Amino acid sequence: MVDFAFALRKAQDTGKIVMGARKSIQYAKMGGAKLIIVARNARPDIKEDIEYYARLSGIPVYEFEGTSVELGTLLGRPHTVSALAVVDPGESAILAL
Amino acid sequence: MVDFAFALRKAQDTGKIVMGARKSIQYAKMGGAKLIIVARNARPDIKEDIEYYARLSGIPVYEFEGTSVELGTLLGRPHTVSALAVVDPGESAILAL
């Protein structure tokens, strides 16, 4: 990952992202996302859940170094965000390896 | 992941793959691979190790449903293979989501 916060902003403004543990799980499970992002302190059960389905389908998982509070802030949401999925990167390089 | 065994064969024959736990760890750690594959029964410490570094860099990890013995067989190696990395997919669709 390169310049995560910038890449995330670019995806959010120009692409399509979906926020929340359940929705991200639905994606890791069913497909339909290009990348799942988890907060470092996302509750263990949620992280393991996402990680299991992500390995099942080969969807990449990226751990945001910071907290669910910091991730919510980065996303401009009035609440914590523990996980999200990138459905379309838009003009972002967030998927670049 | 779609038609894993076929996709893997195509990457192996037309792209670049690297086999082994240490080499895959080096990739998950330093970048340079597009996908890490782990056998279902790869020893837990090795899986966790790869999985940690993969999350650090957002490199996708795919779990092969079968054993390290079966994975070695699939790769035509005379030994078990617990993990590998796809450096170049070649003509393969192994990276498609």
Swiss-Prot record, chains A, B:
InterPro entries: Ribosomal_eL30, Ribosomal_eL30-like, Ribosomal_eL30-like_sf, Ribosomal_eL30_CS, Ribosomal_eL8/eL30/eS12/Gad45. The keyword Ribonucleoprotein applies. NCBIfam families: PRK01018.1. The keyword Zinc-finger does not apply. GO terms for molecular function: RNA binding; structural constituent of ribosome. Belongs to the eukaryotic ribosomal protein eL30 family. GO terms for biological process: translation. It holds the Pfam family Ribosomal_L7Ae. PANTHER family: RIBOSOMAL PROTEIN L30. This is Large ribosomal subunit protein eL30. Keywords: Ribonucleoprotein, Ribosomal protein. GO terms for cellular component: cytosolic large ribosomal subunit.
